[PDB]
Motif scaffolding. Sequence first.
Motif, mmCIF file in Angstrom:
data_model
loop_
_atom_site.group_PDB
_atom_site.id
_atom_site.type_symbol
_atom_site.label_atom_id
_atom_site.label_comp_id
_atom_site.label_asym_id
_atom_site.label_seq_id
_atom_site.Cartn_x
_atom_site.Cartn_y
_atom_site.Cartn_z
ATOM 1 N N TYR A 135 -82.514 -10.112 -79.383
ATOM 2 C CA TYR A 135 -81.452 -9.188 -80.022
ATOM 3 C C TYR A 135 -81.859 -7.810 -79.937
ATOM 4 O O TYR A 135 -81.156 -7.010 -79.624
ATOM 5 C CB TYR A 135 -81.068 -9.786 -81.494
ATOM 6 N N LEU A 136 -83.197 -7.566 -80.568
ATOM 7 C CA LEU A 136 -83.877 -6.314 -80.711
ATOM 8 C C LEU A 136 -83.975 -5.784 -79.301
ATOM 9 O O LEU A 136 -83.580 -4.566 -79.056
ATOM 10 C CB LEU A 136 -84.907 -6.541 -81.334
ATOM 11 N N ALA A 137 -84.361 -6.416 -78.365
ATOM 12 C CA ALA A 137 -84.437 -6.172 -76.982
ATOM 13 C C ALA A 137 -83.154 -5.674 -76.473
ATOM 14 O O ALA A 137 -83.004 -4.486 -75.690
ATOM 15 C CB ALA A 137 -85.113 -7.030 -75.950
ATOM 16 N N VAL A 138 -81.973 -6.324 -76.704
ATOM 17 C CA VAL A 138 -80.699 -5.831 -76.134
ATOM 18 C C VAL A 138 -80.100 -4.871 -76.749
ATOM 19 O O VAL A 138 -79.683 -3.771 -76.162
ATOM 20 C CB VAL A 138 -79.768 -6.977 -76.167
ATOM 21 N N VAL A 184 -70.504 -8.876 -75.675
ATOM 22 C CA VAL A 184 -71.657 -9.641 -75.383
ATOM 23 C C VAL A 184 -72.090 -10.486 -76.694
ATOM 24 O O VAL A 184 -72.789 -9.840 -77.606
ATOM 25 C CB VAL A 184 -72.737 -8.838 -74.732
ATOM 26 N N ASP A 185 -72.123 -11.913 -76.462
ATOM 27 C CA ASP A 185 -72.305 -12.687 -77.423
ATOM 28 C C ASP A 185 -73.652 -13.600 -76.881
ATOM 29 O O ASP A 185 -73.727 -14.318 -75.993
ATOM 30 C CB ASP A 185 -71.299 -13.878 -77.436
ATOM 31 N N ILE A 186 -74.854 -12.937 -77.485
ATOM 32 C CA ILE A 186 -76.095 -13.450 -76.822
ATOM 33 C C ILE A 186 -76.462 -14.997 -76.849
ATOM 34 O O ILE A 186 -76.852 -15.356 -75.997
ATOM 35 C CB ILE A 186 -77.257 -12.629 -77.502
ATOM 36 N N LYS A 187 -75.829 -15.399 -77.994
ATOM 37 C CA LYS A 187 -75.943 -16.771 -78.157
ATOM 38 C C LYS A 187 -74.941 -17.647 -77.166
ATOM 39 O O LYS A 187 -75.585 -18.741 -76.770
ATOM 40 C CB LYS A 187 -75.329 -17.239 -79.585
ATOM 41 N N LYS A 188 -73.949 -17.270 -76.784
ATOM 42 C CA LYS A 188 -73.316 -17.955 -75.551
ATOM 43 C C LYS A 188 -73.939 -17.700 -74.321
ATOM 44 O O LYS A 188 -73.951 -18.820 -73.647
ATOM 45 C CB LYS A 188 -71.956 -17.265 -75.633
ATOM 46 N N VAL A 189 -74.579 -16.601 -74.223
ATOM 47 C CA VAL A 189 -75.197 -16.298 -72.733
ATOM 48 C C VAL A 189 -76.550 -17.349 -72.776
ATOM 49 O O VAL A 189 -76.559 -17.848 -71.643
ATOM 50 C CB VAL A 189 -75.764 -14.935 -72.772
ATOM 51 N N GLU A 240 -75.416 -5.307 -83.405
ATOM 52 C CA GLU A 240 -76.359 -5.036 -84.462
ATOM 53 C C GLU A 240 -75.714 -5.510 -85.729
ATOM 54 O O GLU A 240 -76.582 -5.399 -86.903
ATOM 55 C CB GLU A 240 -77.119 -3.602 -84.424
ATOM 56 N N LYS A 241 -74.296 -5.456 -86.104
ATOM 57 C CA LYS A 241 -73.817 -5.979 -87.123
ATOM 58 C C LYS A 241 -74.195 -7.442 -87.466
ATOM 59 O O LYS A 241 -74.648 -7.930 -88.542
ATOM 60 C CB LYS A 241 -72.334 -5.615 -87.195
ATOM 61 N N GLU A 242 -73.779 -8.101 -86.487
ATOM 62 C CA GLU A 242 -74.242 -9.452 -86.493
ATOM 63 C C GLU A 242 -75.927 -9.714 -86.728
ATOM 64 O O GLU A 242 -76.046 -10.582 -87.641
ATOM 65 C CB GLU A 242 -73.957 -10.221 -85.272
ATOM 66 N N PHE A 243 -76.598 -8.948 -86.068
ATOM 67 C CA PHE A 243 -78.138 -8.928 -86.193
ATOM 68 C C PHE A 243 -78.281 -8.773 -87.717
ATOM 69 O O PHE A 243 -79.210 -9.614 -88.388
ATOM 70 C CB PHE A 243 -78.722 -7.851 -85.414
ATOM 71 N N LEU A 277 -77.418 -6.565 -68.478
ATOM 72 C CA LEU A 277 -76.356 -6.805 -67.311
ATOM 73 C C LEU A 277 -75.133 -6.664 -67.516
ATOM 74 O O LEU A 277 -73.943 -6.100 -66.992
ATOM 75 C CB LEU A 277 -76.820 -7.595 -66.360
ATOM 76 N N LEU A 278 -74.635 -7.490 -68.380
ATOM 77 C CA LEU A 278 -73.527 -7.910 -68.879
ATOM 78 C C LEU A 278 -72.645 -6.706 -69.707
ATOM 79 O O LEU A 278 -71.572 -6.327 -69.671
ATOM 80 C CB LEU A 278 -73.211 -9.217 -69.732
ATOM 81 N N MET A 279 -73.576 -5.949 -70.510
ATOM 82 C CA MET A 279 -72.948 -4.816 -71.364
ATOM 83 C C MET A 279 -72.602 -3.776 -70.384
ATOM 84 O O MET A 279 -71.704 -3.047 -70.458
ATOM 85 C CB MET A 279 -74.139 -4.460 -72.146
ATOM 86 N N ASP A 280 -73.178 -3.630 -69.375
ATOM 87 C CA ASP A 280 -73.133 -2.468 -68.363
ATOM 88 C C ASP A 280 -71.889 -2.985 -67.464
ATOM 89 O O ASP A 280 -70.976 -1.784 -67.092
ATOM 90 C CB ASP A 280 -74.488 -2.233 -67.444
ATOM 91 N N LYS A 281 -71.781 -4.041 -67.295
ATOM 92 C CA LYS A 281 -70.541 -4.659 -66.497
ATOM 93 C C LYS A 281 -69.315 -4.313 -67.264
ATOM 94 O O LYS A 281 -68.361 -3.646 -67.031
ATOM 95 C CB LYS A 281 -70.476 -5.950 -66.068
#
Length: 296
Positions: free
Chosen positions: A269-272, A242-247, A2-5, A231-235
């Motif tokens: 971003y908001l959803a995650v 987790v880098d959403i742009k990389k994903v 959320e800092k990046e957001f 899923l990645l955050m939980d993992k």
Amino acid sequence: MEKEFEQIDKSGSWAAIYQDIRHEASDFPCRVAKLPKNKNRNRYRDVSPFDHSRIKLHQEDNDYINASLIKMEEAQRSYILTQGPLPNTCGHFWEMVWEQKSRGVVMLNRVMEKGSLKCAQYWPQKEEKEMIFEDTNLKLTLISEDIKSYYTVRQLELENLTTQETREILHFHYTTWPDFGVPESPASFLNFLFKVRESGSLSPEHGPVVVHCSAGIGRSGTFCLADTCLLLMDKRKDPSSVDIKKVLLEMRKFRMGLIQTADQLRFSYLAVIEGAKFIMGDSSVQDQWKELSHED
Ligand SMILES: O=C1C[C@@H](c2ccc(C[C@H](NS(=O)(=O)c3cccc(F)c3)C3=NC(Cc4ccccc4F)=C=N3)cc2)S(=O)(=O)N1
Ligand SMILES: [Mg+2]
């Protein structure tokens, strides 16, 4: 995250960020998609599955369908993203569902949106009027449906007429996600996603869930990116990693154009960020989401 957001918001750089992704996105051939004999199997001339990740139908005649296997290795989940079926490819759509052993189908569009057809009526709207797809030898029957304010869940029975085997397929239809747009809220989106998850449809015991919208890239891509990131955050041992742009760039290696507007990216971003609350433990967020979604 959320800092990046927050800094993207302050800088007003969603468009530049989104365009960087489009520029860095993978470019792979789609030769099979472009063969003259497959022209009527494609809803849009500029949206095609890459050859390397396309789903092949098990028929010798023509194995082509505009569908892609998005295999997310680290998250340990695969999805098939496809266009809304055309009048002549509904048989192919169900043949794919059968051959890939999918248990759930996620539909994020409506058949008609703002006066334009976006997808063929590929499932029965009435119990008493089942559908037969002669070219693929499959029968499909509507068993029941649970209609909510912004989405509907349906129980379909898909039968292989040849072997007599039948399978229950779950259909998750999000009805209020406008084209090139976003869901009413992170809450409404997440309420739906967890309904699919809780159904068992996304289980690795089954084949990949089939996700589609009209082209199978804007809305479908938004849905898969949020699900994958959660899923990645939980993992991982540190969800902030987790880098959403990389994903998204990783997903774009399997199908072109996933996420069609800068705002669907911002919505992801908001959803995650919102969904992360549940992953980190919060047991009050889900009901919150349901209340906020006014599904009744
Ligand atoms: O949020 C969304 C967007 C929908 C959607 C995305 C793409 C298309 C394909 C269109 N193809 S076209 O032949 O109607 C068409 C319409 C206008 C200009 C043009 F060159 C072709 C489409 N292409 C651009 C988008 C685009 C641009 C470059 C490469 C690939 C693309 F999909 C905008 N709509 C249709 C619906 S979805 O059902 O994927 N969910
Ligand atoms: Mg009736």
